[PDB]
Design a protein around this ligand. Structure first.
Ligand SMILES: Nc1ncnc2c1ncn2[C@@H]1O[C@H](COP(=O)(O)OP(=O)(O)NP(=O)(O)O)[C@@H](O)[C@H]1O
Ligand SMILES: Nc1ncnc2c1ncn2[C@@H]1O[C@H](COP(=O)(O)OP(=O)(O)NP(=O)(O)O)[C@@H](O)[C@H]1O
Ligand SMILES: [K+]
Ligand SMILES: [K+]
Ligand SMILES: [Mn+2]
Ligand SMILES: [Mn+2]
Ligand SMILES: [Mn+2]
Ligand SMILES: [Mn+2]
Lengths: 321, 321
């Protein structure tokens, strides 16, 4: 995967010079979004799909929230460079132009867009039954951040406070592993802690736009990280410094997954494990930050930045990533 | 397909108010790209995938042109509102991370981006074998257009000259019909007019950024249309006025398709039939427009706009769409 992707990454970096010194000149690839120089401001650009979670939605005929996942994936990435999300286009590659599915998808697209404060301004619909075994939903979002107000993690210093905002659940990463491990063993209707397995797998991703925009307009912020592919390893994209964390207890779907063989170190590398978004602020602003975030979502002090470069220590679990 | 899409379109229109009176306020859905009000200028945004052409690519192992198809699909759409393409992200949804496939894909991505003058600033790579029976490659492009320089077709009037720029071949629409009709009977190694069928089907989509940007900066232009899904029906997106046209002779892959039982009136609603891009100019600019475009690609005077609303007459073929 990394060897295959490197070919595209290297080609992409080569094309940067086509906009050198011109409107749209990019920064480097690697962060949660691209930053494009528009003179007075940066434009942020990101793209992501929902993933195989759509296979669960199709099974129970509930696409009412897949659109929330898609918008969440994209606007939460815009936040991680300090950008205010503005607009989105959706790429909907489907096996069939089913009017019932499309009606369900539209409902969540509105709900997500409302929560994020963005307009859905266009898109593409590709009926490709030979290529698509379901209803793949992806999107591309753009946002804006003023020059001088970009947050990429370069300000992170040892001793900074690390705060986690709770997730709504599995969100949109690790779905294939969870599906193949749990569905054939327990059945989609398996009731676990009052919710069916498909209810655990379909829980829409949380949208962090409002608490994070409030936070960056109120306190000093040194880093912002959506916990997606790679789980806690996403923190290393922000800085070479280390992290000393205490993660919340494993429960819900994550407990179920863990009890079915998956080791905890792999799980902190795959699932958000209850923390959907992480902010890094100076210790001076920790209490103020907790209060702003905790108005909107249950939020924790996870730990501190350390000088153990490149290491993430989950102390209460005896794990280093 | 139209009724299913109506659900998302109406919902996306409802989200416009979330950006009303703000940076990024959108125009209406329906055109080749969306236009977002950034004050001194509009930002153009569009997204599109390659389509089932990637299935032919996988069948024969030739992947170094679908990356051109993806970039062409998106930058040619930005041209159709008068915008200069700036930047693109790509969405690569794959059954597996085959390093050979990704190396080929990156070659075409570089060639396309260099021809269009865009930087590939980021992207997404998603391995989902349960969902994707191949290598689905899509993208999202961003462009810029000044206030008062947008070209939508609103200025098209009866009498206007209609000019077509030759396509390189099938481009990226109608591939599903072409696949199911030709591949079982002939196979991808069948030679037609000195070229293998896979050479016909994988010829990369032409990029029109250079001739079109030169054109709108030189003469008055009333309409621009990439000839994609629905073939010549795309002209009806620019205006309700009619068209009287003389289309090029049916040659190459289109003749082979026609001769295998596809009627001519269906082919003009599916394939570009040799015309990849159409521009509408006032008669007084016709010669100068032909001159600029002929410096880049073979270009034709196709005909004129008429007062026979809602119809496209292909006179030399006796067809009315
Ligand atoms: N196919 C691609 N083409 C170009 N850039 C890509 C591609 N895939 C990934 N990238 C870039 O590589 C970096 C890492 O990508 P990715 O791992 O998708 O980040 P993410 O979106 O934060 N994680 P996730 O939401 O789990 O996919 C980003 O800056 C992307 O822009
Ligand atoms: N899933 C979608 N969500 C939102 N808008 C959409 C969606 N699909 C299509 N649209 C919009 O509907 C209009 C027509 O779409 P489309 O038929 O894809 O245009 P095109 O890209 O010019 N043609 P093609 O290249 O053949 O796909 C555009 O303005 C799109 O932005
Ligand atoms: K991203
Ligand atoms: K488009
Ligand atoms: Mn992401
Ligand atoms: Mn399209
Ligand atoms: Mn298109
Ligand atoms: Mn991604």
């Amino acid at each position: 995967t990394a060897r295959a992707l490197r070919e595209i990454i290297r080609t992409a970096r080569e094309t940067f010079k086509l906009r050198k010194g011109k409107v749209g000149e990019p920064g480097d690839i690697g962060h949660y979004a691209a930053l494009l120089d528009f003179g007075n401001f940066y434009l942020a650009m990101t793209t992501d799909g929902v993933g195989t979670k759509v296979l669960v939605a199709e099974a129970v005929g509930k696409f009412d929230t897949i659109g929330i996942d898609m918008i969440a994936m994209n606007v939460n990435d815009l936040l991680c460079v300090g950008a205010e999300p503005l607009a989105l286009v959706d790429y909907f590659a489907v096996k069939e132009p089913n009017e019932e599915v499309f009606k369900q998808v539209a409902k969540g697209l509105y709900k997500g867009a409302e929560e994020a404060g963005v307009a859905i301004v266009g898109g593409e619909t590709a009926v490709m039954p030979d290529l698509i075994n379901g209803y793949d939903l992806a999107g591309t979002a753009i946002g804006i951040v003023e020059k001088g107000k970009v947050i990429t993690g370069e300000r992170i210093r040892p001793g900074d406070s690390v705060i986690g905002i709770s997730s709504s659940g599995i969100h949109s990463n690790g779905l294939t592993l969870a599906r193949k491990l749990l569905i054939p063993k327990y059945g989609l209707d398996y009731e676990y802690e009052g919710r069916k397995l498909w209810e655990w797998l379909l829980e829409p991703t949380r949208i962090y736009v409002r608490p994070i925009l409030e936070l960056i307009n109120s306190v000093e912020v040194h880093g912002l990280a959506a916990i997606t592919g790679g789980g806690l390893l996403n923190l290393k994209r922000l800085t070479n410094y280390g992290f000393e964390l205490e993660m919340p207890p494993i429960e819900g779907i994550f407990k179920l997954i863990h009890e079915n063989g998956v080791p905890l170190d792999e799980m902190f590398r795959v699932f958000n494990m209850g923390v959907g978004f992480i902010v890094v602020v100076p210790q001076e602003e920790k209490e103020e930050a907790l209060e702003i975030l905790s108005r909107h979502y249950k939020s924790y002090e996870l730990g501190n930045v350390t000088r153990e470069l490149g290491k993430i220590k989950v102390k209460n679990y005896g794990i280093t990533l």
